[PDB]
Amino acid sequence: HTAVQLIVGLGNPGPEYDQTRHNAGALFVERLAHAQGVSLVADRKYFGLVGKFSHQGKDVRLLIPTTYMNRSGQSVAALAGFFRIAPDAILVAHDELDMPPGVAKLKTGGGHGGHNGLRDIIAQLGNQNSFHRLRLGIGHPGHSSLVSGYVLGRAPRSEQELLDTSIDFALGVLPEMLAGDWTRAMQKLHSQK
Template sequence: MTAIRALIGLGNPGQQYEHTRHNAGAWFIEAFARACNTPLRPEKKFFGQYAKITYQGHELHLLVPTTFMNRSGQAVSSLAKFFKFPTSAFLVAHDELDIPSGQARLKQGGGHGGHNGLRDIISAQGNDREFMRLRLGIDHPGNAKLVTNHVLSAPGKAERQSIDDAIDASINVLPLLLQGDSARAMSQLHSIK
């Protein structure tokens, strides 16, 4: 397995989207940056908010694209090209309709599952899907027609707390993931209900 070198959190830019469920991936990066006392700063060449940190002996690049979700690949591919990272060196955090709020799942590779941010990253990386995903559950509204409104709405207080708890649990398994022990990281994270 390729060592993870960059953590990317997907979302939409601007205050109107900041607190919406679709920004759960961005919330993960923001929470991790806060935990590391590292501010994210605008970085034009990576089309996003960026920071470089050393975490438990690992050099990591943190990025929240400031492009819209369906243009996330622009930010990811610019980071990949600049540092000459393979796609497999990325952990991409994103909201996931098929997982209940308050749960998070790690997954290596796979398709985009209809997620526009993942679709654009896969496309921008020449159809390379071999990156690790951190899927942060936001629940499904129950009807496909309600999905857009659901992901672009803010969760209630209790739901937001459950998502934040899942983010904290995800941060707690990062050391295992960075050591290359994805099986144990998944086992630990996936056991949280």
């Protein structure tokens, strides 16, 4: 297995985007940081908020880019490059349109699915090295022309509660994810309600 050394939580910075669907990834990392007693430091050198905690003798770093979503790769590449972290040791949490609230899944490699954050990360790191993704369901509005406004909207209470539940499920498989045991992680996670 390849142990995870970097967990990224995607989102837009600023009050305008706080609590919006498109920040689901950042929410996951915020929750994870709190649970692990990690302080997220604003480090301009990595264009985001950065923290770390030890696991099995190695530093696991948490990153929330504070660039625009569409320049997230700049942040990931800065931190990954500085600490010589290979893409296979990177986990990126993000909002997933193709899954409803309450559902979280894991995936290695693949495309960005219109997600411009993943898009930029894939561009900055390359196409030859896959990284792992924690896909946090936020639902789909039902038409492509509504996607932009939908992800930038604040979901109703019921949907926010469901997202929180999927995040709880995801944290439940943190031991497997940190170890790089994605088969077991998916087994335990994708079998949740």
